[PDB]
Design a protein around this nucleic acid. Sequence first.
RNA 1: CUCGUAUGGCGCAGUGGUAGCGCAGCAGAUUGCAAAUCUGUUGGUCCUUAGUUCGAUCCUGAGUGCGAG
RNA 2: CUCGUAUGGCGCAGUGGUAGCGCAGCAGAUUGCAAAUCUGUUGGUCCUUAGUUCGAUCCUGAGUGCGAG
Lengths: 402, 402
Amino acid sequence: SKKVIVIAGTTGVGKSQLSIQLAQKFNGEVINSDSMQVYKDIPIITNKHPLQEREGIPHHVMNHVDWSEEYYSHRFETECMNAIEDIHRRGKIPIVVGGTHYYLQTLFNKRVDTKSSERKLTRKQLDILESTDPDVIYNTLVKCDPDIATKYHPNDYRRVQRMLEIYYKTGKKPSETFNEQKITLKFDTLFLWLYSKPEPLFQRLDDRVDDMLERGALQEIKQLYEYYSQNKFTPEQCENGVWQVIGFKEFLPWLTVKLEDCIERMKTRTRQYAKRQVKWIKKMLIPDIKGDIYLLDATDLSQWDTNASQRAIAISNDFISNRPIKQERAPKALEELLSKGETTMKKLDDWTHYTCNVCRNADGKNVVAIGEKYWKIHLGSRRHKSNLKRNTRQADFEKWKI
Amino acid sequence: SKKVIVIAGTTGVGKSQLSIQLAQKFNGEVINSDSMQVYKDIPIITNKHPLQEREGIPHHVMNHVDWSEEYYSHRFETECMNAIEDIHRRGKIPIVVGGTHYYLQTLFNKRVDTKSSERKLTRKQLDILESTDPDVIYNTLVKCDPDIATKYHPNDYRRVQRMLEIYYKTGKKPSETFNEQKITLKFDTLFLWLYSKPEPLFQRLDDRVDDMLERGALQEIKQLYEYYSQNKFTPEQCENGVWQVIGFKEFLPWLTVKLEDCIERMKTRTRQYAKRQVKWIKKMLIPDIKGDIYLLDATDLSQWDTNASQRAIAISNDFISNRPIKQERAPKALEELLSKGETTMKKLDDWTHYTCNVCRNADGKNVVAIGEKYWKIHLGSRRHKSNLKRNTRQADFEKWKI
RNA sequence: CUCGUAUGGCGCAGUGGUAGCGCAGCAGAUUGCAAAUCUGUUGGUCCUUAGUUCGAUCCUGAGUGCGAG
RNA sequence: CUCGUAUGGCGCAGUGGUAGCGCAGCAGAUUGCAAAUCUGUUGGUCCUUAGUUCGAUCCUGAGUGCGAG
Ligand SMILES: [Mg+2]
Ligand SMILES: [Mg+2]
Ligand SMILES: [Mg+2]
Ligand SMILES: [Mg+2]
Ligand SMILES: [Zn+2]
Ligand SMILES: [Zn+2]
């Protein structure tokens, strides 16, 4: 009965705090899921409650990757899948905690294997793959497997390129692979959503940036700018590694109310990450695991012990005890959060493309709407209204000539 | 990949009526589950849509059994599995329905493989298995694997006996087998719960019995008593076959007011089945498939086309189209029906046994409560109150003699 | 006119001293029998009355409801 | 009292004919980069008021808040 407990949510609710209670209380090792904490030390700014608070619970896939390195999906795909191994073969229950919920796709069938195949990537194929022009690599995909071709935009470099590579290396179009995909989840899992109202969670996430300088956010980033030298690397790769952490790039140009230049920006970047996190849980995660998840009202921190702690244990208990849970799944307060309307409903289903002939971006290309709902939006945007007006307006230069 | 569309619900909405609407628009075979439709003709009373409005839709597992045969959970566990095969390899899709929701338990990993190891039980083992006394075969189980032993009552013949046979034939205790059981479901499934209010569904189920005589319920049962005469199946083989169908035993005295004797009884038996059906879906099915099911308000039959038909297609559609459904999963009206409280909550979790020393049934044995909740109930039942009262009295006289 | 019977929603057992069984109902169970099987439990205080009595559902008479020649 | 000056949520441009830019904010995508990357979009009656001009956000008269001796 390979069971696995997963804690999802925005930072500022107590995930790395609950993962501790649900650790010894049920014998488990906590795995990480932050495309930041994996980088050697440099805590505080990268968030990670002091070691003397992990209650001796062996964490995995975190604090080990070197600054002058890059962390990708695959990396976690194996490093995580691996930690689960050890934790399992040790009668201990894994507890995956993390903000990059994209990585949660590993805990269940959703990845495309691309290594066991030796499809000789002929020169002609690579030239198309490693092409400088985005539309030429797209049209190629449009031909072979036009299905998946529509699910993406002709400007989605990373995406279109990824799909074609799959068609080439595996031979079998990626459209079919998905049409007959397991989608099931490995190891019986228990998803816990430790959510918190936006307004408060925001006020907290900001006072968290303030009191973040006191703990030594200064030295943190300062010790970060130090590694910046003795190596040198222009923004050609100095914006994809530890560099992303909130506080580095903010004081980067401020080191070649001037304080606000970095303060307000930091507090902003934080919220953005949060907002997206929620979006991914609501539009991706939840819908995929078919609304099977348990919310935890973390809005009021003065009731966390009863609204998130106590509640968590109970739920987590029956989960491990192989006994069906009796918990309502979500407090009446945060009830709509799981409703199809606040989740799956926000998804996209109409992929039919649309092209506006009277509008185009800087790249010269005409605008490309995807979906009736959105195609109709463009046709109503000031943009379209203006181009359409000065169009029929530049035409009125004929009446005054004929 | 291979998908299936089950249709649960009592017998007073249109499960068979809708199983057709979908089986066509989405191309599929309607696998039956009702343990009554699986008998040569005799439909007018065993209920099963006539070929008239059949619209040439293929129906499996039904009408293939003869009056003289005892159908069980295995013959279905095989026939169904086979029927689905054909459908899956014929460019179609299984549209399973049925009334005996128990059998649907086969649509996933649950049962044990007590076939591979056809090990022969030593005389000593069989003697214990095929014992006449229920407590002696139970104590045996209490010893080897006391875990599963508590999940049952010392009077649960069929149950306790079945568990022991699993321990013997497989060697591995049934307690562990369940503690590490898949529980997952084979083939992506879509459960549709075509429910309807109790009051109305009852009024309908009864006018159903009335107009049931007109279609020829008389000849139906009459042609049933005819098969009775041959070999004249004594009350030995009268509860293991078509015999149990409504009308048979009901009108047995009408062939050895006198009309109500069978009328009221019939209408009653009907409701009983319905009530239990709902309970199984609410306490068993739903909880198991983790509240993943779609209700369909069939209370008002004047809105069926919109509340059950239209709605069903839509949901069914995205299901097959491999697109996550956007349907609210259950109309605000019938909302509590899926709530943990109206389902999983009704389950039993405290299995600790309890014995009353002042109470015993006809079998002589003392009462055996299972679970605090219920142990406390017994301690307050009139039964206990009386035995406890007439006890202190016929025991206080001794306290008087001296 | 002759005679028994006249108890939980219905069909029944039963004792001078304060009551039961099955059906139904409610409820739990269900990992080859599930329209089966198992388990628990809510309803009467014995048609009405006056007496017979230390006290009657069970005793006597009667008003009354059914069963018969 | 004499001069600067107020343009969408924040900061800035800008033209005689009825407006932009960066940043926020909102929305969609995501099956080896995801704190990435891609795509779409809502905000102002250009301070108030009165005039020359056919036209006023940009010219002129004061009007009001803000800043300057
Ligand atoms: Mg933390
Ligand atoms: Mg007396
Ligand atoms: Mg003044
Ligand atoms: Mg922006
Ligand atoms: Zn346009
Ligand atoms: Zn008792």
